[PDB]
Amino acid sequence: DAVTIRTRKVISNPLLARRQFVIDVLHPNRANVSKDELREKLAEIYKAEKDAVSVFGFRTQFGGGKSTGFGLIYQSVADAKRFEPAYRLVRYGLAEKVEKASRQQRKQKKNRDKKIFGTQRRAQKRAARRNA
Amino acid sequence: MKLNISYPANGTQKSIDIDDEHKLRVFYEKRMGQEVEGDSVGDEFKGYIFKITGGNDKQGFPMKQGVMHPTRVRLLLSKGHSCYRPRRTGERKRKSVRGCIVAQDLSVLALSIVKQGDNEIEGLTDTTVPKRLGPKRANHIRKFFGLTKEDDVRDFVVRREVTKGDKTYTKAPKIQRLVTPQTLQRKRALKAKKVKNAQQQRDAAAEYAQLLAKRLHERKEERAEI
Amino acid sequence: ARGPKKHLKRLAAPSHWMLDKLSGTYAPRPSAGPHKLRESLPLVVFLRNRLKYALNGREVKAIMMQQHVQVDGKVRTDTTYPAGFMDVITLEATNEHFRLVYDVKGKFAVHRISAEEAAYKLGKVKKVQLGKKGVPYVVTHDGRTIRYPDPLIRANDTVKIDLATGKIDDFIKFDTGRLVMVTGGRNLGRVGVIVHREKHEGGFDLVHIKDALENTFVTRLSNVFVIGTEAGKPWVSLPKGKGIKLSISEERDRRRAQQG
RNA sequence: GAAACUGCGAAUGGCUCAUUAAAUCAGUUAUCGUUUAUUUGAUAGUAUACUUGGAUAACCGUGGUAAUUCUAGAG
RNA sequence: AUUCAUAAUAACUUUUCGAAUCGCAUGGCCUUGUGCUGGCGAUGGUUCAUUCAAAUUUCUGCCCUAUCAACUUUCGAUGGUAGGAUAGUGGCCUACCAUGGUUUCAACGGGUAACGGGGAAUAAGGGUUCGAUUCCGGAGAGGGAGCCUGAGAAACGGCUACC
Numbered sequence: 001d002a003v004t005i006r007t008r009k010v011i012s013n014p015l016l017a018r019r020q021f022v023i024d025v026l027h028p029n030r031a032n033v034s035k036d037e038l039r040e041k042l043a044e045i046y047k048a049e050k051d052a053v054s055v056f057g058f059r060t061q062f063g064g065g066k067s068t069g070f071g072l073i074y075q076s077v078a079d080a081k082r083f084e085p086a087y088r089l090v091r092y093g094l095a096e097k098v099e100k101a102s103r104q105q106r107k108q109k110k111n112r113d114k115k116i117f118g119t120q121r122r123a124q125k126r127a128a129r130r131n132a
Numbered sequence: 133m134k135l136n137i138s139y140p141a142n143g144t145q146k147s148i149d150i151d152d153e154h155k156l157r158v159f160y161e162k163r164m165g166q167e168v169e170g171d172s173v174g175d176e177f178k179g180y181i182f183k184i185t186g187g188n189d190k191q192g193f194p195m196k197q198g199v200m201h202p203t204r205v206r207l208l209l210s211k212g213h214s215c216y217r218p219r220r221t222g223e224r225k226r227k228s229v230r231g232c233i234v235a236q237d238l239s240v241l242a243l244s245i246v247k248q249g250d251n252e253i254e255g256l257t258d259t260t261v262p263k264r265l266g267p268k269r270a271n272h273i274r275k276f277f278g279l280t281k282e283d284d285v286r287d288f289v290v291r292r293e294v295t296k297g298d299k300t301y302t303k304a305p306k307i308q309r310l311v312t313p314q315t316l317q318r319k320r321a322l323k324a325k326k327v328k329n330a331q332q333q334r335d336a337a338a339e340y341a342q343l344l345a346k347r348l349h350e351r352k353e354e355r356a357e358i
Numbered sequence: 359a360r361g362p363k364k365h366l367k368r369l370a371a372p373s374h375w376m377l378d379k380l381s382g383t384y385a386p387r388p389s390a391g392p393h394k395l396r397e398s399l400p401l402v403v404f405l406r407n408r409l410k411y412a413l414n415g416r417e418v419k420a421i422m423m424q425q426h427v428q429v430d431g432k433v434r435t436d437t438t439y440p441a442g443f444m445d446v447i448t449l450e451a452t453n454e455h456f457r458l459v460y461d462v463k464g465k466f467a468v469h470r471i472s473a474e475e476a477a478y479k480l481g482k483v484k485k486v487q488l489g490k491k492g493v494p495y496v497v498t499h500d501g502r503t504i505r506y507p508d509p510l511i512r513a514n515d516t517v518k519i520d521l522a523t524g525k526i527d528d529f530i531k532f533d534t535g536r537l538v539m540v541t542g543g544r545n546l547g548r549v550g551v552i553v554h555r556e557k558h559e560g561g562f563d564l565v566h567i568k569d570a571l572e573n574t575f576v577t578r579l580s581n582v583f584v585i586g587t588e589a590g591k592p593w594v595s596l597p598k599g600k601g602i603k604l605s606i607s608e609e610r611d612r613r614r615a616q617q618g
Numbered sequence: 619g620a621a622a623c624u625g626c627g628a629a630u631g632g633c634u635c636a637u638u639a640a641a642u643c644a645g646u647u648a649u650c651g652u653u654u655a656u657u658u659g660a661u662a663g664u665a666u667a668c669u670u671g672g673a674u675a676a677c678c679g680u681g682g683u684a685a686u687u688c689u690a691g692a693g
Numbered sequence: 694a695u696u697c698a699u700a701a702u703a704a705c706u707u708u709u710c711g712a713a714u715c716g717c718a719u720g721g722c723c724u725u726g727u728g729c730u731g732g733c734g735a736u737g738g739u740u741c742a743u744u745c746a747a748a749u750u751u752c753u754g755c756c757c758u759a760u761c762a763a764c765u766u767u768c769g770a771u772g773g774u775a776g777g778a779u780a781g782u783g784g785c786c787u788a789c790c791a792u793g794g795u796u797u798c799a800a801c802g803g804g805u806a807a808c809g810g811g812g813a814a815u816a817a818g819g820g821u822u823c824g825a826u827u828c829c830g831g832a833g834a835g836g837g838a839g840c841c842u843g844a845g846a847a848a849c850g851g852c853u854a855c856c
Binding site: 490 | 658660
């Protein structure tokens with residue numbers, strides 16, 4: 001209801017081929033909209049694609065209503081993929097959260113490779129022959 | 133007391149076993165690297181001459197050349213020594229090793245066949261193995277194929293072909309120290325850069341010389357007006 | 359302590375970087391380079407905390423890995439490059455240029471300059487002596503070495519250097535009447551003009567200076583950076599203020615006056 | 619793109635306050651009394667060459683010890 | 694401020710190094726030979742400079758204690774000459790020699806429920822008390838000692854030995 005998008009402190013960022021500014025939502029009678037919704041409104045306002053828009057860090061003033069945030073308007077999915085981290089892309093869907101094990105499991109494996117010199121196959125076959 | 137004989141001529145190894153302690157006396161009190169007559173060892177061994185290359189004792193410790201004891205000692209081992217692999221640079225560990233003199237207390241004796249006898253062992257003399265890779269440096273290719281300096285070495289390196297069902301191909305080593313126009317260009321570039329640098333330093337020295345003589349001239353007039 | 363320190367605690371970082379207290383434990387540690395650790399501004403501070411071109415240090419890494427950022431014209435990728443006094447920082451991708459210059463308040467202000475301007479700098483003569491093969495050289499305050507200088511040059515003199523060929527364009531003799539700019543001390547960032555120099559053998563020489571407004575202020579000789587030949591003519595552009603100190607009441611008056 | 623060789627780092631950091639009373643430490647000096655990887659400047663034309671050799675790892679292969687980030691013979 | 698830098702001469706050296714390395718583009722010249730050539734670079738290298746360090750180092754400044762008044766000097770204590778060792782100065786160590794060095798302006802010895810400092814608590818002023826601990830400096834890795842590697846460690850998530 002009467003959602004408005006208000007921008008200040010705009011930096012044209014060619015080094016990362018993007019653009020940095022601050023984004024304010026003026027929404028009454030509502031909790032707040034999802035970040036993705038601000039991405040579609042930013043897209044419609046600035047006639048850029050959805051995947052070239054990224055926003056983050058939204059906080060509302062005391063008393064409800066108005067919220068601030070920070071957003072990036074890239075100039076391709078290619079650019080928004082070149083200059084961006086994995087967690088934002090997993091948020092949107094432009095990537096996938098890689099299925100690594102836990103930190104303890106990975107560290108324990110890496111320490112467990114410190115007890116073998118040379119290739120794993122060599123040790124495996126050697127131990128198999130000695131366990132006959 | 134298992135015997136780990138190997139025949140380098142064919143790249144063949146076979147671990148045999150001797151139990152009758154009356155049939156191993158020919159090695160007792162021998163050292164590492166010394167030669168031994170295979171006639172007295174068993175029966176399949178007539179005519180054979182072996183080189184004592186190493187061994188491990190009943191506790192597993194390896195023999196080490198130069199420790200003239202028939203028992204174990206502890207030595208501070210460092211980089212370059214036998215029986216030790218350093219874990220970090222400069223590390224030295226004190227380790228237990230077996231001497232180079234052969235006794236009954238060994239578990240295994242390592243042997244190399246120096247000259248074949250008259251019979252054949254089922255897998256130690258009759259068969260052969262090939263050398264897993266061929267020459268990789270150019271001049272070793274020349275030496276081993278008897279090639280000439282001027283012969284094209286690119287296309288006569290040996291290839292090995294892996295047959296994974298279809299789309300099959302050979303895999304060939306890169307030749308190091310092969311000469312290319314790239315190598316010549318790099319050498320020319322370095323020589324030219326040395327030439328250029330020497331030139332520009334000579335020019336700079338000359339220009340500074342003229343600057344010195346110039347201010348000499350003006351200084352001479354400046355002092356000549358007093 | 360067994361060997362060289364590689365970390366710089368945030369509270370131990372020089373204050374003239376205006377590093378906020380509560381960001382995190384550590385501060386950028388400027389690499390060994392042309393300028394002293396304390397009297398230099400590493401590039402990550404310049405390209406993040408001043409220009410806000412990057413939100414963080416990872417994006418600083420990305421920006422410099424793409425040949426964007428330049429120091430004295432040459433391309434640098436060392437995020438912690440000790441950029442210091444008179445250094446010229448070129449940003450061709452943004453079409454923007456800078457020069458590290460001490461604003462009067464005591465810091466490195468964000469001093470924009472032109473492309474024609476961003477092709478030279480200035481250098482104080484530390485010493486003059488003969489190297490190997492009798493070749494004379496002079497050492498500058500930025501670790502630059504130049505062979506075959508003018509046979510008249512001595513210590514405490516400023517030279518003009520082209521950022522492309524590394525050659526000396528023109529210089530200045532140190533004597534009374536020169537426009538200068540204090541390099542250290544409490545008089546940091548302010549622009550004055552030489553009045554007199556007092557010579558203490560074995561001690562530290564003292565120099566007497568005067569701002570455009572009549573104010574006589576003394577300073578250690580080792581903090582004097584000659585910037586011109588006479589009053590009113592620097593050899594580089596000066597920041598918003600021209601290096602004259604204004605008292606707190608004066609600045610408050612000016613703030614009220616400007617804002618209405 | 620494993621392994622291994624080579625190079626670099628591992629002398630930073632983090633923890634603690636036991637020792638320590640002109641010692642440590644603080645401000646202030648000195649190196650015309652020394653070493654310094656790295657960084658950044660410079661900087662060497664000096665009176666078989668279409669580019670020299672031989673080792674070893676990685677690797678396949680025989681193993682030994684109850685056991686260790688143990689290793690030996692051979693190609 | 695120098696026997697400084699730099700330069701010269703005569704000789705010396707188990708001869709230091711003055712590039713047998715690597716990636717992408719492949720251009721231009723013809724006296725058309727797998728020709729002569731040459732663009733951004735990687736890495737490396739002697740010396741000097743610089744930067745990051747280090748090691749020494751000047752002056753002044755520490756709590757309680759005399760039921761601690763003399764201390765140091767055999768086996769270095771204070772100094773001189775010569776050497777050895779060190780990265781380098783220096784009793785750092787050795788040889789010979791001299792007999793010096795500190796102390797009531799508190800040496801030396803003993804205590805510390807003592808790491809030092811920036812600081813903290815209370816505070817009319819002057820003071821009193823605290824600071825293991827977010828920063829700086831030091832020291833240690835069970836206790837001791839000795840080393841390897843390396844520019845840099847007497848390193849302990851390095852080694853060696855004893856307890």
